[PDB]
Design a protein around this ligand. Structure first.
Ligand code: CA
Length: 191
């Protein structure tokens, strides 16, 4: 099951979402259980992974990953909420581009053996699950990169909410890999 375009659905019990601007080279493959693998290069913009839909406030995610990025790429819990429309990330690892760059710092949170700095950014007239919109992005960026472990979402959501970053109703919630004008390979197994 190799994707040929942006797509969503459920595979082996796990929701999957793959979004691509169709550029560059990419092969996103749905694999056994909660696993997926992706190989990419060129000048593409994409993000995809496996997880759940809808996401929940207290989900405890356990994942493993063989992550090998080259350029601007992220390995992170990724999802959206509506009312308000929010795109959020719990960055476990990243490439050459630090998501915190020029972002508004909103404190930090210690959870699952790690420490994460919190940030808020904004996307204007950008693609979203509701079409072209202007919305905020919330971030939890690990101070030390890792490619496997447990992520207690309640600790991140509560840290954001308390910092004044409101969350809406949950849309999807996945362990995603993202890339922008980058290359690499990744095999991620959720659950
Ligand atoms: Ca299924």
């Amino acid at each position: 099951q190799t994707l040929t375009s942006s797509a969503t659905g459920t595979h082996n019990g796990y929701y999957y979402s793959f979004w691509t601007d169709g550029q560059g080279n990419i092969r996103f493959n749905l694999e056994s259980g909660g696993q997926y693998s992706v190989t990419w290069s060129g000048n593409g913009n994409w993000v995809g992974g496996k997880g759940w839909n809808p996401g929940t406030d207290n989900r405890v995610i356990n994942y493993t990953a063989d992550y090998r990025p080259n350029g601007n790429s992220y390995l992170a819990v990724y999802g959206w909420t509506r009312n308000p429309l929010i795109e959020y990330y719990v960055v476990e690892s990243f490439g050459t581009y630090d998501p915190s760059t020029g972002a508004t710092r909103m404190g930090s949170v210690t959870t699952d053996g790690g420490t994460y700095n919190i940030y808020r950014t904004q996307r204007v007239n950008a693609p979203s699950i509701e079409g072209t919109k202007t919305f905020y992005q919330y971030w939890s960026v690990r101070t030390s990169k890792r490619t496997g472990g447990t992520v207690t979402m309640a600790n991140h959501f509560n840290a954001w909410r308390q910092a004044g970053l409101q969350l809406g109703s949950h849309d999807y919630q996945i362990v995603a890999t993202e890339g922008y004008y980058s290359s690499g390979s990744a095999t991620v197994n959720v659950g």
